[PDB]
């Protein structure tokens, strides 16, 4: 019949062959056009195991987005290894578009339709499709932006939630808008305070289903490169680094409500020219920002968290923002898919 397999996938997109924006440009040669009327077939009485943490689709997407970035966002200087590389570094238009991943002949994608499927285990409602949904390849840490939302309940996905070395992917039901704007390197981002606190209350409540009736604490990153200790992302081709202390700095007892004790949280940000690459070990330097107002607005649709360990602590659990491996970003979207080969 069929069985789990790894194969070379292809991508599909609605890219504009005329557009100068770099995702469009890449997708014009890397991908085919989307199918106007894609077919999805329910597999009656079929049960299948998935593992979002060992899904090779993720790796294929990762290598593609690496290629997109490499040929799109050229640094003035690269220090990959000990050798320094000088080159042209123009400002570009850079705004993600959805990319779909599809199986070639002889292979198929199975799709789990179970509500709040955690990404690992038996799916009861399976369908087959030729392509995934359209995934914007948004590169960020701490907050997942412009991603998919859970239908009904906040959903937690972790390879082992009690293993403090494992990332915890959180998917929200309601998005929280984050509005950013740009010493020409000084910038800042706003989130609605009431909305963000209601979210944390609900995230806390969900975490208690795994960790028990305990106090849930959100705290800032314990360390690492700036890309992961801040919410880093890009807007208008520029690399933003935003301090999220104002977002992760609260203690939620079992009886706590957002109502306890402007309605705006302002996050201080900086636009950096010197950055650590996510694709690759090494440093890249870009040109300063062009004069004028730089603005972008995104929806927070998920979080990347870690949890503190400890051999002794009852009473509370502490969670901190994390990320850095963009494969986890792709996983947050690809968790419900797996590739199979046909007889």
């Amino acid at each position: 019949v069929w069985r789990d397999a790894d194969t070379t996938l292809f991508c599909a997109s609605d890219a504009k062959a005329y557009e100068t924006e770099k995702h469009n440009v890449w997708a014009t040669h890397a991908c085919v056009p989307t199918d106007p009327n894609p077919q999805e077939i329910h597999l009656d009485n079929v049960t299948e195991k998935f593992n979002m943490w060992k899904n090779n689709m993720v790796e294929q997407m990762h290598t593609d987005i690496i290629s997109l970035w490499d040929q799109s966002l050229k640094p003035c200087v690269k220090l990959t290894g000990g050798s320094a590389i000088t080159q042209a570094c123009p400002k570009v238009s850079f705004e993600p578009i959805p990319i779909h991943y599809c199986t070639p002949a002889g292979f198929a994608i199975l799709k789990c339709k179970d509500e709040g499927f955690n990404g690992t285990g038996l799916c009861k409602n399976v369908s087959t499709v030729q392509c995934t949904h359209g995934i914007k390849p948004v590169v960020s840490t701490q907050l997942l932006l412009n991603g998919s939302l859970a239908e009904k309940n906040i959903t937690i996905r972790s390879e082992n939630i009690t293993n403090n070395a494992k990332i915890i992917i959180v998917q929200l039901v309601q998005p929280v808008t984050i509005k950013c704007i740009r010493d020409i390197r000084q910038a800042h981002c706003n989130v609605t305070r009431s909305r963000w606190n209601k979210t944390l209350q609900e995230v806390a409540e969900k975490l208690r289903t795994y960790f028990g009736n305990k106090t849930i604490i959100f705290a800032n990153s314990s360390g690492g490169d700036l890309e992961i200790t801040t919410h880093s992302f890009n807007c208008g081709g520029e690399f933003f680094y935003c301090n999220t202390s104002g977002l992760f700095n609260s203690t939620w007892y079992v009886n706590s409500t957002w109502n306890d004790t402007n309605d705006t949280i302002t996050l201080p940000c900086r636009i950096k020219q010197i950055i650590n690459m996510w694709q690759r070990a090494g440093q890249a330097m870009y040109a300063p920002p062009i004069p004028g107002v730089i603005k972008c607005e995104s929806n927070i649709t998920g979080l990347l968290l870690t949890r503190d360990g400890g051999k002794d602590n009852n009473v509370n659990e502490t969670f901190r923002p994390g990320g850095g491996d963009m494969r986890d970003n792709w996983r947050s979207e690809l968790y419900k898919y797996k590739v199979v080969e046909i007889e």
Partner: antibody
Amino acid sequence: QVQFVQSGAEVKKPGASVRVSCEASGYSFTDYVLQWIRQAPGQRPEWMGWIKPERGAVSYAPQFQGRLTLTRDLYTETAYMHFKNLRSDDTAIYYCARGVRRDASWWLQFWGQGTLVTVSS
Amino acid sequence: EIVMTQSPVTVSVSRGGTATLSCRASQGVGSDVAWYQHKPGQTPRLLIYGASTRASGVPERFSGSGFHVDFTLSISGLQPEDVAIYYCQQYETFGQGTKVEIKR
């Protein structure tokens, strides 16, 4: 072969600070969690924290939060443990170690030779 | 909060016999347990991981069986060189250790 070479023994007064280094070789340094473990006399092993060298993400045992920092140097593939405000019961052998597999970060197959840190007046 | 409780405190078995060491978890932890040998003044040595998998280089007389909350390390054909303290581990948490000696 996977191998970790640590710095030499340290002797300190209470309140002082120590830095222990751990030189990694024989594997892809950025693809594995690196664990720090100590063992004091007559005591079981005690987890200090870990570091993921690719971007330097860390986790610190709660009892050491505020005086423990873990860093790395990717050019020399060396990890460092910085441990401050030392107390006499910090006297122990300190190790860096690595798991059997990338997805088995706790099952410590490979250990540095250990570093004795003695803290006393 | 996870507690790993080892027993007995001391195992005393004649040479060539089998030592059976137990480790109980305070809550279910699947197969996620490891065992170490420790001799004073030496680096701890991984014996068994994932409850039952023998680590590279470890003699075949060491074996493990465990799941959920109960975990066992067995040493058949006990040798004087196996005299040591043995620790179980669940991620960052370690048991208190069990000493194994030769009975003579």
